């Protein structure tokens, strides 16, 4: 299982 | 060898003739880059449709009111690029698309800034995210992934020229014009970077083990993240999948990846070697650059000059119904653009 919509950028993980 | 004397030959000619070219497109770039603003207004537009959204703001397709063209303006609201890191990265965004010149990336056409927002308008390009035709067919079959991936390992090879990491590839970014090819967008986190840099950032799935751990890191992760995406095209989903970022970033790290049964051994190979923990055996990362991905094995078949020519008959050419059509991007919640009547972020925004 994982994410299979639009995936965000993280600007500062 | 592997190449016989002709082959040889035309091979090295070939790559001398790429050091000329690039040669003659950094001279290009850095007069763009050495001399930059303000070349069209908000109410010079007709705003139709959000075409995407993000954590700063919306793409908006819009008509420019005096020629009627069509235009993709991304709209960032000055107060949410509220973090440090999210100034600069805008800074950069701006300063790099106006500098590059390149068929597969995006042409900027005007930038300006208001009291609310900061605006940049570039070619719509009609044909949709490569991320939602992926998603609706499953996935690409290896010579129509590799087509796609011929044209990033291009942009990739010139934008590293010019010291450019782009550091956010992924399906999301890259929209089908309307001959088949790929024109990628979002220079949210590209950058200027003559050796290494440290800021932590990307998107979760297409990170480089060296991002995640925190080390300061170099255009290498853009040659990984080529691996995650054309595993993506190639199997469906990404080779690191999971619900959480922090189940994702585990995976990454770990060292290990499991393929497909249907992926060819070529393909295999050639993702091994990208999708490479180690910096001193990653592809890209070696003595001899960006050719040991060119003339890999899974890429025999590509004429690399004919990619760039765009001479190659592309493997699907979206559906067109006309000027401004949006039938090819998803639908999105529709928010009133509001301008204060007060400045906001004016020094933060200066050079903008
Ligand atoms: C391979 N092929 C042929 N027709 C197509 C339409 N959409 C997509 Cl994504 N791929 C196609």
Known sequence: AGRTGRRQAIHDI | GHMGNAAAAKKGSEQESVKEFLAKAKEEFLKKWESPQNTAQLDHFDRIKTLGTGSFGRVMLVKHKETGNHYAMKIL????????????????????????????????????????????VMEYVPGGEMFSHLRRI???????????????????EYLHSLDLIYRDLKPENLLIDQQGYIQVTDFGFAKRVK????????????????????KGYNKAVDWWALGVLIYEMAAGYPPFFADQPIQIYEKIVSGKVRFPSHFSSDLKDLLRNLLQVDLTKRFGNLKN??????????????????????????????????????????????????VSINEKCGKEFTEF
Request: charged residues 25%.
């Open chain 2, 138 to 156: 499953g996935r690409f079959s290896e010579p129509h992934a590799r087509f796609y991936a011929a044209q990033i390992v291009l942009t990739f």
């Open chain 2, 289 to 338: 650059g960006v050719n040991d991905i060119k003339n890999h094995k899974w890429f025999a078949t590509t004429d690399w000059i004919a990619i760039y020519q765009r001479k190659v008959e592309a493997p699907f050419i979206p559906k067109f119904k006309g000027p401004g059509d949006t039938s090819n991007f998803d639908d999105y919640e529709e928010e009133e653009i509001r």
């Open chain 2, 77 to 120: 609201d000055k107060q949410k690029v509220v973090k440090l890191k999210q100034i600069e990265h805008t800074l950069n965004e701006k300063r790099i698309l106006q500098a590059v010149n390149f068929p597969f990336l995006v042409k900027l056409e005007f930038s300006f800034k208001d009291n609310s927002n900061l605006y940049m």
């Open chain 2, 195 to 214: 050796g290494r840099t440290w800021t932590l950032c990307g998107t979760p799935e297409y990170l480089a083990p060296e991002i995640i751990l925190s």
